[PDB]
C-alpha positions as a Markdown table, in Angstrom:
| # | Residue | x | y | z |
|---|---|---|---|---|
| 1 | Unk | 75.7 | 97.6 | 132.2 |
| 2 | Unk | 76.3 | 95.4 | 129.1 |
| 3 | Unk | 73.5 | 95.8 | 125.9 |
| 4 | Unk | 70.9 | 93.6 | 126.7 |
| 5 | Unk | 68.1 | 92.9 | 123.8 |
| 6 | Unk | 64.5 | 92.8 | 124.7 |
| 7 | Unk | 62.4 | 92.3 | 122.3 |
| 8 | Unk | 58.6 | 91.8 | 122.7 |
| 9 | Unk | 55.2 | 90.7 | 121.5 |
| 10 | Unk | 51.3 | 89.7 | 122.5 |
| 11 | Unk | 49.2 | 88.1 | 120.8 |
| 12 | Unk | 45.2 | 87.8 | 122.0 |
| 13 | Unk | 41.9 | 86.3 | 120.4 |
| 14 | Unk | 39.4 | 88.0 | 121.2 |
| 15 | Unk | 38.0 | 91.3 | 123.0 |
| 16 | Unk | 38.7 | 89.9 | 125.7 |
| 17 | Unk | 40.2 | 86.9 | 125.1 |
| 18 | Unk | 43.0 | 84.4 | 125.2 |
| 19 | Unk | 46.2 | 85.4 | 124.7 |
| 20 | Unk | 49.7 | 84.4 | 125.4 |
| 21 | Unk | 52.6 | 86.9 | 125.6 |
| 22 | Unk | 56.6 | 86.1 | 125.2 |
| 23 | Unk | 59.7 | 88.1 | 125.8 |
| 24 | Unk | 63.2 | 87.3 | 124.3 |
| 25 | Unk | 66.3 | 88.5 | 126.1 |
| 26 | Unk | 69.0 | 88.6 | 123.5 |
| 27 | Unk | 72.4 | 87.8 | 125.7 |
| 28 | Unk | 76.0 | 88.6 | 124.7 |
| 29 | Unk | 76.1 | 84.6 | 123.7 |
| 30 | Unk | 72.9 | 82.8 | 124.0 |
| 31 | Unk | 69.0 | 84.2 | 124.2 |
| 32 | Unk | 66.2 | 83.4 | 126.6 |
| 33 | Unk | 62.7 | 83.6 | 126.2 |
| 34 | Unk | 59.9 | 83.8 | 128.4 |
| 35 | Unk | 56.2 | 82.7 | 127.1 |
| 36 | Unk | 53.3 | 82.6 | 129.7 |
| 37 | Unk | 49.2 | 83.4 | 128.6 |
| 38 | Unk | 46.1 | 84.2 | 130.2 |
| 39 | Unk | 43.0 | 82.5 | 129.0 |
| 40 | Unk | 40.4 | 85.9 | 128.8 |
| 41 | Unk | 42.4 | 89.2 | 128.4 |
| 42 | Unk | 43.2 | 91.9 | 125.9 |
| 43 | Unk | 46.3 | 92.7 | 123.5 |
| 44 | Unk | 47.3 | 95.6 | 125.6 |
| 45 | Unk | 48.0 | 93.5 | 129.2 |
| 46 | Unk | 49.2 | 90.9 | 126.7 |
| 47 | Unk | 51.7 | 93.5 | 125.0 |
| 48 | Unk | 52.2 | 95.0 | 128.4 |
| 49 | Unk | 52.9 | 91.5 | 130.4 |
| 50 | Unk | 55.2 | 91.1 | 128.0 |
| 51 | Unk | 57.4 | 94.3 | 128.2 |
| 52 | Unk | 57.5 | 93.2 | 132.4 |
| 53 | Unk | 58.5 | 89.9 | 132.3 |
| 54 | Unk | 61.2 | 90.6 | 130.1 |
| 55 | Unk | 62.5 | 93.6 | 132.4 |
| 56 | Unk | 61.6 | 91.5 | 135.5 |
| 57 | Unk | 63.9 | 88.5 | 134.7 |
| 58 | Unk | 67.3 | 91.0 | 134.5 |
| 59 | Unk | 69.2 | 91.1 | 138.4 |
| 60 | Unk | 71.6 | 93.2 | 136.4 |
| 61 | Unk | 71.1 | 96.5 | 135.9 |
| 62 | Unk | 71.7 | 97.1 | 131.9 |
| 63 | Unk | 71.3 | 98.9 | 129.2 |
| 64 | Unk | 68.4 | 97.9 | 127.4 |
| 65 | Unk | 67.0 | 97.9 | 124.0 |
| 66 | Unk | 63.4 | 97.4 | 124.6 |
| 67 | Unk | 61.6 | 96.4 | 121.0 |
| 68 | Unk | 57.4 | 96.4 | 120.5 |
| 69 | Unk | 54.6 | 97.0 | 117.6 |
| 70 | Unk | 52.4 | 97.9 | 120.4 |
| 71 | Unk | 49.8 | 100.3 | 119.1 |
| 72 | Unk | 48.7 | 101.2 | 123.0 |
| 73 | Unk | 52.8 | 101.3 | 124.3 |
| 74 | Unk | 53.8 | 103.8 | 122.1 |
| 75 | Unk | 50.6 | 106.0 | 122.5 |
| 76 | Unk | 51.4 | 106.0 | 126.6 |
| 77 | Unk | 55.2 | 106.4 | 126.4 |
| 78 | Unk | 55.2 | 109.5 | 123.3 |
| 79 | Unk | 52.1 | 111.5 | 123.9 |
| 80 | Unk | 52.8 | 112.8 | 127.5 |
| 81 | Unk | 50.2 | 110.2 | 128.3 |
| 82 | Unk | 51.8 | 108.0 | 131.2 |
| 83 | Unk | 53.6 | 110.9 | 132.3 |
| 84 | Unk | 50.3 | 112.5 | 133.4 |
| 85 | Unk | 48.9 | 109.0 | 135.4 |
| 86 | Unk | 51.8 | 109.0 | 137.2 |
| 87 | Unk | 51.0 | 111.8 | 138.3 |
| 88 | Unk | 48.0 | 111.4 | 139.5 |
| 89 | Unk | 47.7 | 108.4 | 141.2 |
| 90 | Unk | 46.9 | 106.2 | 138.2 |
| 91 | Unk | 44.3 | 109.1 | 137.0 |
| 92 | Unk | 42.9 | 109.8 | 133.8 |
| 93 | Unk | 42.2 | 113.8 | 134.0 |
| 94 | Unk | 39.0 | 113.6 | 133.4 |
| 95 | Unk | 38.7 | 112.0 | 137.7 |
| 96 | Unk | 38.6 | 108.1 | 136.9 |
| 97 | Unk | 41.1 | 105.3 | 137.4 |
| 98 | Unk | 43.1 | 104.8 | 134.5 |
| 99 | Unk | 42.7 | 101.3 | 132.6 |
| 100 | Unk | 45.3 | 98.7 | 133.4 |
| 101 | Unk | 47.0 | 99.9 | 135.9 |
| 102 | Unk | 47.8 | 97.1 | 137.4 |
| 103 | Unk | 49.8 | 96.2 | 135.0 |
| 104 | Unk | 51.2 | 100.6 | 134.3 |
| 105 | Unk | 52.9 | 100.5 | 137.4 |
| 106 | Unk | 54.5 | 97.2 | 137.2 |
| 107 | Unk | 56.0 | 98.2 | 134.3 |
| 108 | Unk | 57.4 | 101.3 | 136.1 |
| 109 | Unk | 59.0 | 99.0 | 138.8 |
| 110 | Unk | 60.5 | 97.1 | 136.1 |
| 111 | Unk | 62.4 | 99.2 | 134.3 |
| 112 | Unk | 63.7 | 100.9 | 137.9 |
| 113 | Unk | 67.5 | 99.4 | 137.9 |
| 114 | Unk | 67.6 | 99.8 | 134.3 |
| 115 | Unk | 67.9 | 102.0 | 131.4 |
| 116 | Unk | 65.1 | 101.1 | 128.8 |
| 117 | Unk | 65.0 | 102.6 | 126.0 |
| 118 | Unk | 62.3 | 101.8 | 123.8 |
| 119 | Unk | 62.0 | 100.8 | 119.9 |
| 120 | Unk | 58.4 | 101.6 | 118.7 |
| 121 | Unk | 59.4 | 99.8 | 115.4 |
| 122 | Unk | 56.1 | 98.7 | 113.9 |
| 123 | Unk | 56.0 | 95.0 | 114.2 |
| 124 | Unk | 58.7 | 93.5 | 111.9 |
| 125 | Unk | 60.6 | 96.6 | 110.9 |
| 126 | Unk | 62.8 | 94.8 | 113.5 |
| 127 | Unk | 65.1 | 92.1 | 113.2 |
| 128 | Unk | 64.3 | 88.3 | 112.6 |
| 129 | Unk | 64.7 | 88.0 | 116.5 |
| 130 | Unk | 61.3 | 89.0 | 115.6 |
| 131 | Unk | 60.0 | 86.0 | 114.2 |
| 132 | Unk | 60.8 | 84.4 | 117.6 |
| 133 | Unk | 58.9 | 86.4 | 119.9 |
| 134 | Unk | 55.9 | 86.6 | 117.1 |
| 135 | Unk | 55.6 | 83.0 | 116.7 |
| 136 | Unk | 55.8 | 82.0 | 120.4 |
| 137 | Unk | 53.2 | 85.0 | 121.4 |
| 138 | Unk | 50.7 | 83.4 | 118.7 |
| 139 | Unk | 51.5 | 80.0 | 119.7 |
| 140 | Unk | 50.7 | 80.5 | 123.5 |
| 141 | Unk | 47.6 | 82.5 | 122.6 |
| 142 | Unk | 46.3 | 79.6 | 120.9 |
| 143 | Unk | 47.1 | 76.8 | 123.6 |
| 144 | Unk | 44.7 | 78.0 | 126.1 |
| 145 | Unk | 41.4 | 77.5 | 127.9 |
| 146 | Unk | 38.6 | 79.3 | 125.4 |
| 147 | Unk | 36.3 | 80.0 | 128.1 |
């Protein structure tokens, strides 16, 4: 293993929109952060992208410390929510195809070699590796196409 320090954030402009996400892997010595962004799309992918890239880029099964203010992460991961699409081939009980699932099960393959676990601190009740991941989710939001 070795405590790894993902912290994340996603940042959109509009319903959908363009947003940009960014991931920062806090090392034992020295960080790395990973910004990409989608011109039309929604916070939640954008929150969600984020989470996955950061796990994605990680050959080395660690511990984890995953960090997000996503409103729509922590309702999945607490509430017995994902639990139940899993089960169901990506199914919302009610018989339809749950939203985003694209994206639901990537996440899932993600976090496979590792152990995650996650920080629902709202927003910046974390530390000012915070700021970093904030900024640069903004910042890729707004250098888009607005189309």
């Amino acid at each position: 293993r070795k405590r790894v320090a993902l912290f994340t954030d996603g940042a959109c402009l509009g319903n959908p929109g363009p947003g940009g996400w960014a991931a920062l892997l806090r090392f034992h010595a020295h960080e790395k952060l990973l910004s990409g962004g989608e011109a039309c799309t929604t916070n939640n992918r954008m929150e969600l992208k984020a989470a996955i890239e950061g796990l994605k880029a990680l050959k080395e099964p660690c511990e984890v410390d995953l960090y997000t203010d996503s409103h729509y992460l922590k309702k999945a991961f607490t509430e017995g929510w994902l639990e139940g699409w899993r089960k169901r081939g990506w199914r919302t009980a009610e018989g339809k195809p749950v939203k985003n699932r694209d994206l639901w099960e990537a996440l899932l393959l993600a976090m496979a070699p590792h152990r995650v676990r996650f920080h629902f601190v709202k927003g910046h009740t974390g530390h000012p590796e915070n700021e970093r991941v904030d900024r640069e989710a903004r910042r890729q939001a707004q250098s888009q196409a607005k189309t």
